[PDB]
Symmetry: C4
Subunit: 25 residues, 4 copies
């Protein structure tokens, strides 16, 4: 499976997209 | 192999690049 | 080992972040 | 475990987030 550090960076990417979308709305 | 979440973040990233390329063309 | 989609996105992220850093200098 | 390029991209993503925060400070 993926390294915790990689998991953490992917979560950061996903949250950033969600925050950006919420801001645009 | 890779965690679902990490695969999903990668697909978002690839889509992000496609969209940017399309915008610039 | 990593999913091939994850390696490909990582390589794109690296190039992107490299360009970002050069500009920030 | 995760490929070296995947680990590297994740670290560079974390570096970017931190440079972005410090930039605003
Ligand atoms: C603690 C983990 C939360 C990470 C989510 C916040 C990431 C915000 O950081 C981002 O702000 C962007 C604005 O769209 C800028 O374009 C920057 O490139 C930066 O990466
Ligand atoms: C998960 C990592 C995938 C990385 C995909 C890169 C997303 C491309 O998108 C970015 O392209 C840059 C130039 O290439 C532009 O300066 C913009 O910041 C754009 O958002
Ligand atoms: C800019 C900072 C980037 C640092 C990148 C370090 C990533 C390497 O890290 C990798 O090294 C491998 C050696 O082949 C080990 O086998 C480990 O699996 C590890 O993932
Ligand atoms: Cl991985």
């Amino acid at each position: 499976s993926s390294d915790p550090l990689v998991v953490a960076a992917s979560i950061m990417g996903i949250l950033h997209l969600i925050l950006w979308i919420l801001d645009r709305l």
